[PDB]
Design a protein around this nucleic acid. Structure first.
Ligand SMILES: [Mg+2]
Ligand SMILES: [Mg+2]
Lengths: 143, 49, 221, 178, 152, 99
RNA sequence: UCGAAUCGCCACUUCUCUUAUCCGGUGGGCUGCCCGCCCGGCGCCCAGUACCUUCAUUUUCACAAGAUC
RNA sequence: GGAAUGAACCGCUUAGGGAUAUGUGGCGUCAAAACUUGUGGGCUCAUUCUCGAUACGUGAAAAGGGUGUUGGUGGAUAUCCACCGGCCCCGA
RNA sequence: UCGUGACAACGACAAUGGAAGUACCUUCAUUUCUCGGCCAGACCCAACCUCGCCGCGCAAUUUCCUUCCGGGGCUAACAUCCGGUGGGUCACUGUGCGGGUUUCGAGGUCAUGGGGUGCGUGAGUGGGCGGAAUAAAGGG
């Protein structure tokens, strides 16, 4: 029933949902893990922020074709993520309000992770990095 | 192509609906059971002749 | 291949000490000559660096007299006008293997000549390759997978000895010394191997129990 | 499933006319890869035995015969083949198989290997499931006794296609190339 | 000269094909190349034909007659309980381990890495304290020889 | 046997060895890395001066599997890959990802 | 002087032999079956499985902008 | 475009170019394709012009032989004789 | 046809030639410089082309399956085989075919065209976009 003109319309694969844990495949943060927060209003990129104290990835935009979405999911009902908006990236040494937004989001995200029964294992999991060793076959894996 | 198929044959919608009903699970199991009974009954009656 | 002074000064300026490229060492004992060469030739063309050892233990199907006659027929071909230009008949097992591989390459192009330069062949296991790592085999060219048990085969070293090879006794003496030296060292260094195995068994009793349960589930301990 | 040369039964007759009303109906057994070949063999036999050609005849039925259950049995096949040098040769052979189609498929491959006879030069006269104590071939009767057992030697094992390698380490199973 | 014999009642493991790594019992021999296999207690594994190049014979064997009914085979398996004995073998454990890794979810893969790193850390520590006394490694043996140069 | 066509290239990837395996890599981006002999323009020549070098790359994509053994066919955008690359390294990246 | 392509390493691999062969070795009981006995590794982000702490503005892919020699 | 090579053989017959699929012929290396495919049967061992292996292409061979090995047919007796094939060997 | 300065490299396939790139030159032509007629990436619509998954019709599925007794055979049996008796209402191996709009999990086009809904005379034709309705006629 959703129309293409409506903002809520989107065509992204069903594995990429809020709270999903993804592996970054390209960029300066290649091989690191992060958490998908939301999607931009139109059919735009996703916004990811792995807890910056865990993996070192700040709030950023990323295309859905450059992340591998795993099956591990953290409940995100508590985190509002309403402050995330296209204008924060539209504006062109970090700024004060950007730091405040990052701190607020990280605090809520960390509490949600610890709420999971495997909270400690999840925190260690977010620390790990992914790499292709000699003799690996990523096409045979399940994720 | 769906719109070309319907343009050339306006009966396509009902023909496909018959196929979907043929594939339905409950109806196809009843049809299989009914066929076995009908064939077996005729075999016994013909032999008794 | 011996470095010149220019290479020595450049390495000293930049502080470079040693470098070893990626090389695969193949033990050719009890391998079929034709099938080993065909597999090696393709891998060379794909850009691999290969070193083969123990070339004198290659095997060819058929009796020794049949294969000896085959080589003598090849030895008869020569340029009558000037034999020093004619075909060259190399006699050592490593030279025979290199000739066989060369016949399976585009040898008259620069691409083919480069591929041939990437192969090094030895008789026995020389001292400079003993400590370089574990050797490999080619399962599709092994004797016990290729020949029926009742057939008769020829060992390349014995065939070459009777057509002109002169170093069969030298190679045999060197191999005897290497087996003695390596066997003594492997009898040594067993206390460390046993100690390492004991340490792993001592673990799973001090390490966390949750991680032990995971190892059991995946069949590792 | 494995064997080619399925088991067919073809029923046909000659087209009725006002010299020969109500012609005789014939039944024919044949082993063919498909029913088109099966019908071709039927009309060849009808022509060479009853002077009836496919142009003046009808085919009433052509189906596949169902065999018995799966078990180890002895099959006797009497077969004939032609060659220019010797003419027609007739023989009776025995095989071990689980179905009639399998035994006949074995015979066709055996005749090609041992006598170089192709499919269209071969005629099958019959196939029967005979009991033990009625086999005259030692190479077949050796599988009869109870407590029969033998080992597997000179095996040539191959890995599943997903795990085949080219180079492997000498004292382990670790792959090097591929 | 030492092998498991092919006969009625011998347990085999399938090598390749749709039934790869399954276990069945030989119920009959047809010729030098083919046999009949059945496993009543497992899905699929009804009576079917198998080539002798596609099986491996195991140590266990059941006592049945040639071409026995699926029933009598069932009680024979239950009485001997060979299926349980095979499952406890080391080779069966390795096969199940290989399968479990193929169906992992990449979070258990992280857990397996943590467990393997924890075991390796403790092995290194235990080895080191047992090497301080009774030197074994190259550096401890060399250190003892160099300390013997104490005439200065 | 008649000759070669240089508009399509064949790439062999490690640990694939199967057509079903090669189907996983259809549509992935690849590149061939080499070097020239003087520094020329590159991406982010002004934003990231540390990237300036003699290194160069030629990009392409995987189109379809080749044969039955994991070989794949690659087209390098609008031109051919130079023949000096025969037998050299090719990078196969994991994006665009369908997982 | 040189900006370059290559991207697992180990003093647990880096000894030997066999495949009609105890597939780690090795006995007994009555052909073949049954019953026993003794004994590749690391590496993938806390130098270690605790859950402490720095990563940003390089703001959506681009030769790893980093390593090795 | 194929049969290594060939006016006439096999396929196909032609404006300048992409994608897809085939024909003849092929899938150990040269050389693209079974990284030496099958969870298909048999047969063959061939010492100095060196067993055999793409028709046309005789563009390499006969009469006559073999207790080499592997199959049949007809007779006898609780294994023996006669005859006919397949591959290989002598004739060469 | 020859000399000279500078430069380009080059084994031995006699040179010359064709096709497709690349490394160094050239500064010849054209475009752009706060918008670009440049280079990449992802997304949307149409068209064409693939893959997963789920199925159907037909006496094709009785030269068949099962129980018992009588032979026969093996070893004490069972079994292969032959006559009958009584029952026959997870794969059973042939032959024709289907399935996304009150929706049956995806992919490719650097191998196609788009203004990529902006819009005002630059013709979204759609079971697919709008706005009404709710089993409407047609099957087991
Ligand atoms: Mg090839
Ligand atoms: Mg509508």
């Amino acid at each position: 029933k959703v129309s293409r003109k409506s903002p809520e319309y989107s065509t992204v694969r069903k594995s990429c949902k809020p709270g999903t844990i993804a592996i970054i495949l390209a960029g300066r943060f290649r091989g690191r893990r992060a958490v998908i927060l939301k999607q931009l209003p139109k059919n735009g990129p996703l916004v990811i922020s792995g807890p910056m104290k865990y993996s070192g990835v700040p709030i950023r935009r990323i295309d859905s074709r450059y992340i591998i979405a795993t099956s591990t999911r953290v409940d995100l009902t508590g985190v509002d993520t309403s402050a995330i908006t296209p204008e924060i990236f539209k504006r062109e040494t970090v700024s004060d309000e950007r730091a405040q937004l990052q701190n607020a989001i990280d605090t809520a995200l960390i509490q949600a992770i610890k709420k999971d029964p495997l909270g400690k294992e999840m925190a260690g999991y977010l620390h790990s990095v992914f790499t292709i060793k000699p003799g690996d076959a990523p096409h045979r894996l399940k994720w | 192509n769906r719109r070309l198929r319907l343009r050339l044959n306006p009966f396509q919608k009902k023909e496909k609906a018959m196929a979907k009903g043929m594939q339905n699970k409950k109806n196809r199991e009843a049809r299989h059971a009914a066929k076995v009974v009908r064939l077996a009954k005729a075999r016994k009656n013909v032999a008794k002749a | 291949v011996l470095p010149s002074r220019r290479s020595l000064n450049r390495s000293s300026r930049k502080g470079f000490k040693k470098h070893r490229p990626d090389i695969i060492v193949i033990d050719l004992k009890d391998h079929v000559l034709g099938r080993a060469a065909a597999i090696v030739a393709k891998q060379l063309l794909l850009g691999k660096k290969i070193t083969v050892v123990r070339c004198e233990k290659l095997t060819i199907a058929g009796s020794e007299i049949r294969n000896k006659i085959k080589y003598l027929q090849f030895l008869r071909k020569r340029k009558l006008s000037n034999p020093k230009l004619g075909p060259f008949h190399h006699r050592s097992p490593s030279d025979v293997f290199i000739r066989t591989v060369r016949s399976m390459l585009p040898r008259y192009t620069k691409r083919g000549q480069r591929a041939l330069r990437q192969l090094v062949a030895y008789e026995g296991v020389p001292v400079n390759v003993v400590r370089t790592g574990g050797r490999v085999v080619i399962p599709k060219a092994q004797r016990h997978n290729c020949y029926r048990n009742e057939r008769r085969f020829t060992v390349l070293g014995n065939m070459c000895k009777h057509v002109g090879w002169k170093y069969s006794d030298v190679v045999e003496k060197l191999e005897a010394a290497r087996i003695e030296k390596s066997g003594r060292h492997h009898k040594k260094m067993e206390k460390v191997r046993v100690a390492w195995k004991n340490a792993r068994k001592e673990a799973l009793k001090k390490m966390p129990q949750k991680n032990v349960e995971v190892l059991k589930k995946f069949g590792l301990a | 499933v494995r064997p080619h040369l399925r088991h067919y039964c073809v029923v046909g007759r000659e087209t009725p006319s006002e010299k020969n009303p109500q012609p005789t109906v014939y039944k024919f057994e044949v082993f063919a890869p498909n029913f088109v070949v099966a019908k071709s063999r039927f009309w060849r036999m009808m022509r060479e035995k009853n002077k009836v050609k496919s142009t003046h005849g009808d085919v009433l039925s052509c189906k596949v015969v169902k065999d018995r259950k799966l078990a180890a049995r002895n099959y006797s096949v009497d077969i004939a083949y032609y060659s220019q040098r010797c003419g027609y040769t007739h023989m009776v052979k025995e095989f071990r198989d689980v179905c009639k189609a399998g035994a006949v498929s074995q015979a066709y491959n055996d005749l090609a290997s041992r006598h170089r006879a192709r499919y269209h030069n071969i005629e099958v006269l019959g196939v029967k499931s005979i009991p033990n104590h009625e086999v005259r071939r030692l190479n077949v009767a050796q599988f009869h006794p109870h407590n029969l057992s033998f080992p597997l030697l000179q095996r040539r094992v191959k890995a599943p296609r997903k795990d085949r390698v080219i180079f492997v380490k000498k004292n382990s199973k670790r792959a090097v190339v591929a | 000269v030492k092998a498991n014999y092919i006969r009625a009642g011998r347990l085999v493991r399938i090598l390749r094909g749709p039934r790869q790594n399954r276990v069945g019992v030989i119920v009959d021999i047809v010729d030098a190349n083919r046999v009949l296999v059945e496993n009543p207690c497992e899905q699929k594994m009804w009576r079917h034909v198998q080539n002798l190049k596609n099986v491996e014979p195991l140590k266990f064997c059941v006592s049945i007659s040639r071409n026995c009914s699926t029933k009598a085979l069932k009680e024979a398996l239950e009485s001997k309980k060979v299926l349980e004995k095979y499952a406890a073998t080391k080779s069966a454990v390795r096969i199940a381990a290989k399968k479990a890794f193929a169906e992992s979810t990449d979070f258990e893969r992280y857990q397996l890495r943590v467990a393997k790193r924890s075991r390796a850390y403790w092995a290194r520590k235990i080895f080191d304290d047992n090497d301080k006394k009774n030197p074994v490694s190259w550096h401890k043996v060399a250190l003892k020889k160099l300390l013997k140069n104490a005439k200065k | 046997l008649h000759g070669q066509n240089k508009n399509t290239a064949l790439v062999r990837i490690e640990n694939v060895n199967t057509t079903e395996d090669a189907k996983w890599y259809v549509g992935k981006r690849v590149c061939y890395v080499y070097h020239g002999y003087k520094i020329k323009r590159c991406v982010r020549w002004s934003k990231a001066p540390a990237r300036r070098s003699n290194t160069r790359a030629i990009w392409g994509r995987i189109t379809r599997p080749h044969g039955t053994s994991g070989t794949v066919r690659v087209k390098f955008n609008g031109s051919s890959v130079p023949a000096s690359a025969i037998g050299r390294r090719i990078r196969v990246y994991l994006y665009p990802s369908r997982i």
